[PDB]
């Protein structure tokens, strides 16, 4: 199955006897699921994301079926706004990122050039938007707030911004704010024909 990114890459997952929809997030190291009844022993833990940090329970050796493919791994249950399938599980179902082909055993970082500066960014299929760390950018912007795992952050919106991603050019909206890492969302990934194969 091959997935384009014009729409959030949602899939069906069966976990703990229950059926849920979850987002294939190349930008997440871990898999985070909304609060749900899970049998077993857990361990308190915290994870970071945009907007802040959240407290979650960690369950190891959990079985999960993603689009028919079974997989066993660590699962984090917590106050997430969306069920997220991170790289720990994506690699188990042979998930690849084709735009070159990128495996997910390592965070999918690529180099981008924007505003005459070179930076590294994370290819995030789980993000609708592209949010970059504070930086000198010409043009006029507009205030805006986006949400993430730990909450909402205030960012400056710039439209019609040229970006060269791993070689290819693309023009689109870029949000600039307090992000822990530069994020390339679906509004640009689609422009460089990035597909998700597994």
Q: Provide the experimental method for this PDB entry.
A: X-ray
- What's the total number of domains in the chain? 2
Indicate if 3 and 92 belong to the same structural domain.
yes
Indicate if 72 and 121 belong to the same structural domain.
no
Asked if 55 and 73 count as a contact pair (C-beta separation under 8 A), the reply is no
Indicate if 122 and 190 belong to the same structural domain.
yes
SS3 annotation, 66-107: ECCEEEEEEEEECCCCCCEECHHHHHHHCCEEECCEEECCCC
Indicate if 37 and 124 belong to the same structural domain.
no
Indicate if 77 and 111 belong to the same structural domain.
no
Indicate if 47 and 109 belong to the same structural domain.
no
Indicate if 21 and 58 belong to the same structural domain.
yes
Query: Which of these three, 99, 131, 146, is where a domain ends?
Result: 99
Query: Which of these three, 99, 115, 147, is where a domain ends?
Result: 99
Q: Which of 193, 119, 127 is nearest to 163 (CA)?
A: 119
Instruction: Find the CATH number of the domain harbouring 62.
Output: 2.40.70.10
Indicate if 37 and 116 belong to the same structural domain.
no
Which residues are marked as active site? Answer: 25, 124
Q: How far apart are CA 121 and CA 131, in angstroms?
A: 9
Task: Name 89's Cβ contacts closer than 8 Å, sequence gap at least 6.
Answer: 31, 64, 66, 71, 73
Indicate if 93 and 105 belong to the same structural domain.
no
List Cβ<8 Å contacts ≥24 apart for 65-73: 65/13, 65/14, 65/15, 66/11, 66/12, 66/13, 66/22, 66/93, 67/1, 67/11, 67/12, 67/13, 67/93, 67/198, 69/93, 69/198, 73/31
At 186, is the secondary structure helix, strand, or coil? helix
Rounded to 10 degrees, the C-alpha dihedral 118/121/127/128 comes to 20
Residue 74 CB burial class (10 angstroms; 0-12, 13-18, ≥19): middle
At 35, list the tokens.
């609060």
Indicate if 59 and 120 belong to the same structural domain.
no
Q: How far apart are CA 5 and CA 125, in angstroms?
A: 7
Indicate if 94 and 105 belong to the same structural domain.
no
Query: Which of these three, 99, 127, 160, is where a domain ends?
Result: 99
Q: How far apart are CA 126 and CA 28, in angstroms?
A: 8
Q: What are phi and psi of 188, to 5 degrees?
A: -115, -30
Indicate if 58 and 129 belong to the same structural domain.
no
The boundaries of the domain holding residue 189 are 100-198
Rounded to 10 degrees, the C-alpha dihedral 49/197/173/154 comes to -10
Q: Where are the alpha helices (DSSP H) in the chain?
A: 87-90, 186-189
Resolution for the entry shown, Å? 2.1
């Amino acid at each position: 199955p091959q997935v384009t990114l014009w729409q959030r890459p949602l899939v069906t997952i069966k976990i703990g006897g229950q059926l849920k929809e979850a987002l294939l997030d190349t930008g997440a190291d871990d898999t985070v699921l909304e609060e749900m009844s899970l049998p077993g022993r857990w361990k308190p833990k915290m994870i970071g994301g945009i907007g802040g940090f959240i407290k979650v329970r960690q369950y190891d050796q959990i079985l999960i079926e993603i689009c028919g493919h079974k997989a066993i791994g660590t699962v984090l249950v917590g106050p997430t706004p969306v069920n997220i399938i991170g790289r720990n599980l994506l690699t188990q179902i042979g998930m690849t990122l084709n735009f070159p082909q990128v495996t997910l055993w390592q965070r999918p970082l690529v180099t981008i050039k924007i505003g005459g500066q070179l930076k590294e960014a994370l290819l995030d299929t789980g993000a609708d938007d592209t949010v970059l760390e504070e930086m000198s950018l010409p043009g006029r912007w507009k205030p805006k707030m986006i949400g993430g795992i730990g909450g909402f952050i205030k960012v400056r919106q710039y439209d019609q911004i040229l970006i060269e991603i791993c070689g290819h050019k693309a023009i689109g909206t870029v949000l600039v704010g307090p992000t822990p890492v530069n994020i390339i969302g679906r509004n640009l990934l689609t422009q460089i024909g990035a597909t998700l194969n597994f």
